[PDB]
Amino acid sequence: LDEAQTIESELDKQLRAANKVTCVLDTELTLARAAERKAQQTAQQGMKEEERELSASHFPVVTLEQLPDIRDLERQHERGIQHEIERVKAELHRLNIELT
Amino acid sequence: LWREKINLLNARLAEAQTSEEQLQSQLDLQKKVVSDHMQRYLQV
Amino acid sequence: LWREKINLLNARLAEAQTSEEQLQSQLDLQKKVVSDHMQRYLQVDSDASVAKAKLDEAQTIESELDKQLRAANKVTCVLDTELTLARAAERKAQQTAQQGMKEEERELSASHFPVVTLEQLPDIRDLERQHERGIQHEIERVKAELHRLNIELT
């Protein structure tokens, strides 16, 4: 009877390990939900068809499992656009000086 | 991509929940065995 | 801040473990009724009748305490996940921090640079970009003014 109780406790320990796995997966799901809702409202701002086409033709997208790296794309692409917009503005300033 | 990730995470969680249910079944079986030794002492 | 997170989670997980231990003790006490009602029946409305009647009742009511214990395990799981995340993030944050800055640079920055909180820690790298972008916007504005004044100068 004591041995059977010990085996029952072992099975309860296995059940608790499964519960821990389930809770970890549920927390991963919660993190995914939080990220989705964070990206939700910004996605709902509505866009023109021309802007949508331009973004499609000018910006790539990360895959499903590599989704965490999407923020790297945001950073690098925004930095590159920051650089090139500044370059065109500097050219505009030099040309304005020449025109003056 | 995050909605897709949510779908994938739920699909993965399904296996964990099924494992939990099966371990519950095994725990019930072990409780029944414990109950058999439980009653054996009243039958000797 | 991630070091603070680690140090706080190390104790929050301990509190969760304490709750789990209390619920485990309660479940063991619930089983104790059945375990005692074994030897009561053999060691003697009588005691044997009470043991027989309440043996199954104690086992049946055990479901609630087990459910309470199962619910409490979730706190430990969430706290452990948070502790693992803090462990992962803190080392990278420190190694990036090893780039370093002179003390005078630290005071110069200290003029306006913020102190991020633990609750701000999850979004620390978005508030960072927010502050940096504000600084960049001011830079651009004064730069445009500089260029207008350069037009005047020419």
Task: Give a verbal description of the structure.
The structure is cut from a larger assembly and holds three copies of chain A. Chain A is mostly helical and about 100 residues long. The first copy, chain A, has helices spanning about 1-45, 50-60, 70-100. Chain A is rod-shaped and about 100 Å long. Chain A starts with a helix and ends with a helix. Chains in contact: A-B, A-C, B-C.
The secondary-structure element order of chain A is: HHH
What is the terminal-to-terminal distance of chain A?
100 Å
Oligomer: part of a larger assembly
Residue fraction in strands of chain A: under 5%
Could you tell me which chain pair has the largest interface and how many residues each side has?
Answer: A-B, 28 and 28 residues
Kindly name the structural category of chain A.
mainly alpha
The DSSP helix count of chain A reads 3
DSSP summary, beta strand count of chain A: 0
Q: Whole-number radius of gyration of chain A? A: 27 Å
Shape of chain A: rod-shaped
Characterize the main sheet of chain A: none
Give the % helix of chain A: over 70%
What's the arrangement of secondary structure elements?
The structure is cut from a larger assembly and holds 3 copies of chain A.
Chain A: H1 2-43, H2 49-58, H3 70-99
